[PDB]
Amino acid sequence: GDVAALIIYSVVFLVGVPGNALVVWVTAFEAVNAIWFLNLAVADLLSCLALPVLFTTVLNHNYWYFDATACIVLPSLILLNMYASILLLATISADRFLLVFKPIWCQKVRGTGLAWMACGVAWVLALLLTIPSFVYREAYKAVAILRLMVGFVLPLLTLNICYTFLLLRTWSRKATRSTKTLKVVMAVVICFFIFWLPYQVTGVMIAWLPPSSPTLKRVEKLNSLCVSLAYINCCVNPIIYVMAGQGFHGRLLRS
């Protein structure tokens, strides 16, 4: 089943890094609403640049002979990038909810500085979530639970609550009924959940599992598949943004 994973990283890299580079290039012309997507696309690009690193070892029978000191920097970097992307998605959801429920308050205090501060806070949170990989692995418990909680459950709850309230308020007056909002919200939520659930569940499963030599040999065989699914999510995140906004098409054609 690892050949399916091979194909998945291949297609993820191909339908990723060109699109991520293009999105970064167009968004670099920031537009308070573009800072969030700029940071998300930067995190996506940084995470996608390391895909061949994972793709080589799996072809090498799951062996890491690249460097003794390089076994602590690349997994940590990709973990930090993934957590940064998740936290930025949660921050965009909160920003949309605040800009819908508070049209006036989120207009007099809105600015580039607030968005930059929020993005920096998300990056700091990702780094704090990632220092376990900095300080607890070498070349060749509670961390898994806290990461599961504060990187999948809380962001998902914020996404769900913010979008539920946003649609409930939006679909209440004929002046702002629309149809696209429900489609994009449902698509992004279902994509996030269906592509991030297996990674987290397998992470915790290979985390408690008291016997080191048990009958769990299947989840070791599916870990690469789960990471590849997470990579599909990370690659497809800049697809909704490019599809929804025709201003992206106009800017890309002009540039």
Binding site: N62, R137, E138, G203, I206, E220, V227
Partner: peptide, 6 residues
Amino acid sequence: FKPXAX
């Protein structure tokens, strides 16, 4: 040690 990512 865990044999890979995690």
